[PDB]
């Protein structure tokens, strides 16, 4: 079922702007583009859309409360920096089973300043000699890393 309808669904009868956790995993996505999230959601600190068919987060909106993005096995493969301008306050990121190959695509993730946990399972980037050690000197601001530490 198509995002936008699912967000609609999900939302039972609720203005979007006193929502606080949404979860839109398995729906599908626009083409590969996110659907129906406007910076009307202004509460919403927990976002989670998991297998949407995701290829891109280049058009997420303001979501100045969003401390928890999900977005597992999904083939997002970079524009990452968008993240730091929409939604700067998150601490957990979820990019497990996505299209993450290499450490450049996740160094604009250091404008992340309140970043403590980011999961990267069964990411190509996982196979790196010195795999954490890396993403850790990359990202000092990170605690947790797959679950670890």
Do not use: W
């Not at 509460?43 to 997420?60: H, K, P, R, W, Y």
């Not at 990019?95 to 404008?111: A, F, Q, R, V, Y």
């Not at 850790?136 to 679950?147: A, I, M, N, S």
Request: hydrophobic share 35%; proline share 3%.
């Amino acid at each position: 079922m198509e995002m936008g309808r699912r967000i609609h669904l999900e939302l039972r009868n609720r203005t979007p702007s006193d929502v606080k956790e949404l979860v839109l995993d398995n729906s599908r996505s626009n083409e590969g583009k996110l659907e129906g999230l406007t910076d009307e959601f202004e509460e919403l600190e927990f976002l989670s859309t998991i297998n949407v068919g995701l290829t891109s987060i280049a058009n997420l909106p303001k979501l100045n409360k969003l401390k928890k993005l999900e977005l597992s096995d999904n083939r997002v493969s970079g524009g990452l920096e968008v993240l730091a301008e929409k939604c700067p306050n998150l601490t957990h990121l979820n990019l497990s089973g996505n299209k993450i190959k290499d450490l450049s695509t996740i160094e604009p993730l250091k404008k992340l300043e309140n970043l403590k946990s980011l999961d990267l399972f069964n990411c190509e980037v996982t196979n790196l000699n010195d795999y954490r050690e890396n993403v850790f000197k990359l990202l000092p601001q990170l605690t947790y890393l797959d679950g670890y530490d």
